[PDB]
A paper describes a structure:
The head binds with high affinity to junctional adhesion molecule-A (JAM-A), which serves as a receptor for all known reovirus serotypes.
The GM2 glycan binds to the upper region of the T1L σ1 head and thus not near the β-spiral region as predicted earlier. The Neu5Ac residue contributes the majority of the contacts between GM2 and T1L σ1 and is wedged into a shallow groove bordered on each side by β-strands B and C. Additional contacts involve the GalNAc moiety. The lactose component, which forms the backbone of the branched glycan and would be linked to the ceramide anchor in the GM2 ganglioside, points away from the protein. The N-acetyl and glycerol chains of Neu5Ac insert between β-strands B and C, where they form hydrogen bonds with backbone atoms of both β-strands. Additionally, the methyl group of the Neu5Ac N-acetyl chain inserts into a hydrophobic pocket flanked by V354, F369, and M372, consistent with the dominance of this group in the STD NMR spectrum.
Author numbering:
A (entry chain C): 266 to 469
B (entry chain B), C (entry chain A): 265 to 469
The structure:
Amino acid sequence: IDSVLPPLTVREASGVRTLSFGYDTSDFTIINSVLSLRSRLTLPTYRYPLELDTANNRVQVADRFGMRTGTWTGQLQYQHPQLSWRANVTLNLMKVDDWLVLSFSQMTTNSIMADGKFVINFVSGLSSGWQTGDTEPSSTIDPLSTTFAAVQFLNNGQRIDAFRIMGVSEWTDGELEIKNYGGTYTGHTQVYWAPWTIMYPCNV
Amino acid sequence: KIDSVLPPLTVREASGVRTLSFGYDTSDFTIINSVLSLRSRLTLPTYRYPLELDTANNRVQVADRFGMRTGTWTGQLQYQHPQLSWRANVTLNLMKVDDWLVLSFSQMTTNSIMADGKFVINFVSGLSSGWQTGDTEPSSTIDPLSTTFAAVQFLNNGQRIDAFRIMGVSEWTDGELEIKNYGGTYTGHTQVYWAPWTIMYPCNV
Amino acid sequence: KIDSVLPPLTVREASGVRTLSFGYDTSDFTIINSVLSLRSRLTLPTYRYPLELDTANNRVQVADRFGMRTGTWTGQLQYQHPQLSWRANVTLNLMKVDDWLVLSFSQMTTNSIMADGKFVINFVSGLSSGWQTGDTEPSSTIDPLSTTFAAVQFLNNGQRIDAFRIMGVSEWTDGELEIKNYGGTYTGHTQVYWAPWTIMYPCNV
Ligand SMILES: CC(=O)N[C@H]1[C@H](O[C@@H]2[C@H](O[C@]3(C(=O)O)C[C@H](O)[C@@H](NC(C)=O)[C@H]([C@H](O)[C@H](O)CO)O3)[C@@H](O)[C@H](O[C@H]3[C@H](O)[C@@H](O)[C@H](O)O[C@@H]3CO)O[C@@H]2CO)O[C@H](CO)[C@H](O)[C@@H]1O
Ligand SMILES: CC(=O)N[C@H]1[C@H](O[C@@H]2[C@H](O[C@]3(C(=O)O)C[C@H](O)[C@@H](NC(C)=O)[C@H]([C@H](O)[C@H](O)CO)O3)[C@@H](O)[C@H](O[C@H]3[C@H](O)[C@@H](O)[C@H](O)O[C@@H]3CO)O[C@@H]2CO)O[C@H](CO)[C@H](O)[C@@H]1O
Ligand SMILES: CC(=O)N[C@H]1[C@H](O[C@@H]2[C@H](O[C@]3(C(=O)O)C[C@H](O)[C@@H](NC(C)=O)[C@H]([C@H](O)[C@H](O)CO)O3)[C@@H](O)[C@H](O[C@H]3[C@H](O)[C@@H](O)[C@H](O)O[C@@H]3CO)O[C@@H]2CO)O[C@H](CO)[C@H](O)[C@@H]1O
């Protein structure tokens, strides 16, 4: 080789011509006498609800995060020291972001006291894809949320309009507790409940 | 002449032939077309809304609009019942918060209503700028999607009677949102004063 | 002497003069300040809250606090009406869920109220550790931001009368949140028993 071009360089100090390769020190280095990249970049992974769409090399929020549906089939338990019963219900469930929504269709139940508790046992009854743990609230604050239910008290053929205030109050080993603090009331033998929804924070 | 070399450059005089080569990291680079080239150049991913890349500061973030996007719908609130139906001019405030759509009703005075009935909002037209009809479509068919109470005053021959109305988001069909009034307390009346109220439902558009 | 040269290295014997040169990929590398450098070194982006980089596992995630952040406000709930106003000592639970702020009221006994009025919460002081006054600012000026019902019992000369109160989040001004009580059912009374209730509004802080 007669002469050389950059990056290649020849330095002829002390009557001895020596060839050397020139690189950007920030970009490269020599490791085990070979040109190596300095800091090879490892691409991060993503935790749900963030996901990598490998097909289009795109990071996105999972679709299910905005909406995940399900159903719970079981017995709605009403609890009061002087009165308690079980009614067969099917409620719709929807996970919207960090919230769990419960949707009750209309229902006819036995009579209730001026106040009381409703208990939903998620230990069993959940539709496919759902685990009991998926219904656990993300806080122990009481109440997590309150809503009103519109009811009709049935007493000797007449239907009497009233309301019931409902609060999500507790979750214990898969048992969700919805307190009925009260509302308007009259003596009755049976209750007609219009549809209603209740939701609470849930980050599972 | 070039007397000697330094790494990466190496001279192996193997098989009676003094030959020069350039030593590189086998996994970082590979020669192709007789030029040093990067073995696996990394393509950086793109981002789907609400994730966005702030190119100015090279920062990935959640879009601001995702947390809050406001709007208005101007149109006629339709009340529907077989024995009574009417249209009232309203302007509703709308707000997209995350994967929820909130509807905000200001106070209103309407004609009388039956013990139960439907409210229909036609989003086909009336939305403010930036909003499309499709933007109001719920993300589920569950009925009801959400329920709330509206506080009302029934006007009947001069006296104002306080009552409530339960409202549920029940259906969306080709831009028509249906809000069912299942019932609540009631009395015979000439007109209804509605206090303000909000209702929201899941919406991932 | 060097007999031969291996790629990347190549020699061009153009006009009886052998010129040694380094062969590199035109798009992968370049020559700056007479040295091999990288053509477009890729800078990895940073992340704005609620997105965060877990450096320990090199994983991008949504911060846990985004789904749930709790707190408390201790202060005096102010009831306001031109003909009646009072202050009651309360402790409210707060929870930030995504882009929402939830306020949780436990049961309470207060003085009597008018047919309508305002509740004011002064967040300027009283917030638990980690919380700033600005953290309670709504993300919209829409009125109402949200409405809910509170179940009450009016105490009127020994008898307890069940009724409801409609509550709307209406305004936030320099740390003072205003919750309007538009009305609801009513009767003359001496004191009010309030059942627990929650109210939430959009908040992207
Ligand atoms: C409309 C009706 O039959 N009402 C009965 C009630 O019947 C049950 C069920 O109706 C509802 C209801 O309208 O109250 C529907 C609703 O989705 C359910 N609510 C929830 C939250 O899931 C409730 C609820 O589970 C119960 O009322 C609580 O006690 O029930 C009917 O759809 C169901 O109908 C079957 C018919 O009886 C049968 O002839 C037909 O072939 O098949 C359908 C099912 O596909 O029957 C349910 C029986 O419980 O029952 C209550 C007493 O439990 C009262 O008598 C209502 O008057
Ligand atoms: C206060 C009042 O005028 N009330 C009338 C009502 O007037 C309409 C509107 O008022 C409100 C209301 O307070 O009832 C405001 C509210 O934001 C609206 N609510 C919703 C959910 O959109 C309602 C609602 O649209 C109607 O009640 C439907 O019945 O209405 C007034 O702000 C508006 O005022 C105009 C004046 O009439 C006009 O002189 C002035 O120059 O401009 C203002 C602003 O454009 O008028 C509205 C329509 O009349 O109207 C109802 C009957 O529709 C009753 O008569 C109320 O008593
Ligand atoms: C005694 C009682 O339970 N009810 C009193 C009320 O007493 C206050 C407080 O109770 C509650 C209540 O249930 O009414 C609890 C509740 O969480 C509070 N609500 C909110 C939203 O913060 C309310 C609210 O502060 C008031 O109703 C406003 O008027 O209060 C009691 O737990 C508390 O108990 C203390 C003992 O009295 C004291 O001897 C002991 O040393 O410490 C405990 C705990 O600090 O007392 C509270 C006093 O206000 O008070 C109201 C009048 O303010 C009525 O008399 C209720 O009947």
